């Protein structure tokens, strides 16, 4: 008792099948960027889904995520690490 006291990713099913589950999911990214270009050239349908969740800035995505208006935000890795810390 004392010891006790001491004591997936981009290819997700909810991603590859967005809004295809009992709870509709939501996620998008900023258009006209390198990340948006990569998505269109590897997952056409996944790129098409995000068209209605396009953001316009880093802060807007963070606040919308905080308000619950968005569930996931995809963006550059280097800067989103900075905002997280």
Partner 1 sequence: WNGMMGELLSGQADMIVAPLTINNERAQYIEFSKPFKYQGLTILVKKFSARILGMVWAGFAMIIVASYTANLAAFLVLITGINDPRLRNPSDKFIYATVKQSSVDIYFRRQVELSTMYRHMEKHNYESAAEAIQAVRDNKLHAFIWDSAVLEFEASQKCDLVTTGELFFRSGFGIGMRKDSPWKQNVSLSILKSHENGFMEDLDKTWVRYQE
Ligand X SMILES: *[C@@H]1O[C@H](CO)[C@@H](O[C@@H]2O[C@H](CO)[C@@H](O)[C@H](O)[C@H]2NC(C)=O)[C@H](O)[C@H]1NC(C)=O
Binding residues for L-glutamate: 34-35, 76
72 phi and psi angles, rounded to 5 deg: -145, 145
Nearer to partner 1, 1 or 78 (CB): 1
Binding residues (CB under 6 A) for ligand X: these are: 30-32, 56
- Residue 5 as a binder of partner 1 (CB under 8 A): the answer is yes
Residue in this structure with the two tokens 């997700």, named with its chain if needed: 12
Task: Enumerate residues 15-34 that contact partner 1 by CB under 8 A.
Answer: none
Residues at the site binding partner 1, with contacts judged by CB under 8 A: 1-6, 38, 42
């Amino acid at each position: 008792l004392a010891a006790f006291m001491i004591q997936s990713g981009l290819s997700d099913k909810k991603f590859q099948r967005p809004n295809d589950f009992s709870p509709p999911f939501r996620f998008g990214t900023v258009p006209n960027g390198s990340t948006e270009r990569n998505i269109r050239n590897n997952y056409a349908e996944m790129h098409a889904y995000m068209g209605k969740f396009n953001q316009r800035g880093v802060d807007d995505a963070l606040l919308s995520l905080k308000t619950g208006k968005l569930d996931a935000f995809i963006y550059d890795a280097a800067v989103l690490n900075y905002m997280a810390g």
